[PDB]
Design a protein around this ligand. Structure first.
Ligand code: NRW
Ligand code: CL
Ligand code: MN
Ligand code: ZN
Length: 453
């Protein structure tokens, strides 16, 4: 009645040994956690990264948020210190419930959240912080610089120090030379009571990992990757405004929606309260949303393992939706092949398999455009072009392996799926621009095979 809490997601308590390597651990829990979309990881009891900062010198610009179910919000985008925000946040929650903050049951805040967002006549608005790490506001984890205490240095090189996560050997998003600071740098989140994150999945269907440094809990709802399209069909029915096309990445539209609505619609949903010192991990294409129970401070980062590689290719195939890419998946694959000698051997083996598919698809696409009467061709170093200068005019995909150009439309490109969409000139006026010949590509893949042995 009113709100039935979804079942709890899995909670893992790894030993110091299991905990040692995050990527090995994540791979281990994957068969369980991928069925629920999110999971919680409790670190071993003594793993306690020191959080220290001045609440007066850290400044940030707050976002403002209206709390209405099914209303469109833009996913990314006054001035507080951490202290003045905290004072605002505590007073807000205290006044809302006429209670001291620690006496307000989490179950009640959850019930109340879903009451207030559904109720038209309540116009509750809240504020929050969300920015990537910078000099005005830096990571909650120890970083290198200022003299560090011995305990801080203990955690400098932790796998679970979220600064290190994108640049470890197991991960594939590291050696991406391309500018993608929005998604390989950690984001910092300053929460207050009811401040919420709308239903979404991560760019390129990556994993994410969220650490709550301190404060009151963060409540999560998650849906397994296998159910992503079920969820979207439900959302399209109840809020079609979110699904109209949108000129870029800055304008992705998202919304608050009751998990019970999804569960009625046969979409599996799980929940958890994430407390201070705990991790939440989201898996590829796992929808998630949630809200904060009170004043808190979280840090999160995207990442990609070898398990993710085939999904990353399927994700870019964005093409059907005409959605912008954050980076070129093929460019990343070829960059890794060009570094085959210093790659991890398991990485090498998995990249090799994705590369083989890439090459077979590219062979077929080039044959098709040849049969359309595109004859002239020229090598082109796509990776040198700013991304906005190498998007398919039609489907907006970021080109790297190849594209079609025409002298009559200088600077415009289409991917090889959209040769007919470039201009009205006959095909013999077109040029195939390619990064590599098929003969360049087979030795690159062979280097991976030798490294993988
Ligand atoms: C508005 C708005 C902002 C978001 C969002 O995405 N946030 C705050 C980031 C986040 C926090 C926790 C987990 N995943 C993402 O949604 N609506
Ligand atoms: Cl409301
Ligand atoms: Mn997220
Ligand atoms: Zn295209």
């Amino acid at each position: 009645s009113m709100f039935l809490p979804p079942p709890e997601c899995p909670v893992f308590e790894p030993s110091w040994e299991e905990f040692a390597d995050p990527f090995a651990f994540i791979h281990k829990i994957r068969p369980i956690a991928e069925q629920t979309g999110i999971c919680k990881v409790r670190p071993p009891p003594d793993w306690q990264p020191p959080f220290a900062c001045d609440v007066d010198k850290l400044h940030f610009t707050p976002r403002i948020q209206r709390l209405n179910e099914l209303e469109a919000q833009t996913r990314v985008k006054r001035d507080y210190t951490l202290r003045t925000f905290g004072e605002m946040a505590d007073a807000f929650k205290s006044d809302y419930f006429n209670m001291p903050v620690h006496m307000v049951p989490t179950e009640l805040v959850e019930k109340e959240f879903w009451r207030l967002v559904s109720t038209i006549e309540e116009d509750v608005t809240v504020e929050y912080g969300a920015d990537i790490a910078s000099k005005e506001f830096g990571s909650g984890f120890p970083v290198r610089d200022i003299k560090l205490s011995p305990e801080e240095e203990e955690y400098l090189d932790s796998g679970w120090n979220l600064n290190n996560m994108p640049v470890m050997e197991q991960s594939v998003l590291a050696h991406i030379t391309a500018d993608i600071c929005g998604m390989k740098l950690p984001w910092l989140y300053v929460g207050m009571c009811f401040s919420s994150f709308c239903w979404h999945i991560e760019d390129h269907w990556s994993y994410s990992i969220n650490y709550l440094h301190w404060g009151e809990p963060k409540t999560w709802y998650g849906v397994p990757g296998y159910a992503a399209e079920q969820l979207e069909n439900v959302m399209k029915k109840l809020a079609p405004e979110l699904f109209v096309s949108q000129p870029d990445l800055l304008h992705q539209l998202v919304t608050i929606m009751n998990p019970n609505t999804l569960m009625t619609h046969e979409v599996p949903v799980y929940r958890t309260n994430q407390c201070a010192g705990e991790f939440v991990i989201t898996f590829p294409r796992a929808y998630h949303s949630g809200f904060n129970q009170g004043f808190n401070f979280a840090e999160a980062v995207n990442f990609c393992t070898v398990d993710w590689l085939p999904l990353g290719r399927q994700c870019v195939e964005y093409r059907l939706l005409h959605r912008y890419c954050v980076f070129s998946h093929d460019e990343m694959i070829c960059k890794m092949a060009s570094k085959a000698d210093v790659l991890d051997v398991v990485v090498a083996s998995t990249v090799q398999k994705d590369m083989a598919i890439m090459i077979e698809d590219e062979k077929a696409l080039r044959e098709t455009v040849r049969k359309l009467g595109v004859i002239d061709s020229e090598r082109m170093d796509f990776e040198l072009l700013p991304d906005d200068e190498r998007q398919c005019v039609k489907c907006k995909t970021t080109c790297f392996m190849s594209a079609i150009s025409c002298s009559c439309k200088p600077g415009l490109l289409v991917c090889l799926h959209h040769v007919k969409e470039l201009c009205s000139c006959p095909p013999y006026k077109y040029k195939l621009r390619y990064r590599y010949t098929l003969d360049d590509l087979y030795p690159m893949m062979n280097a991976l095979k030798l490294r993988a042995e």
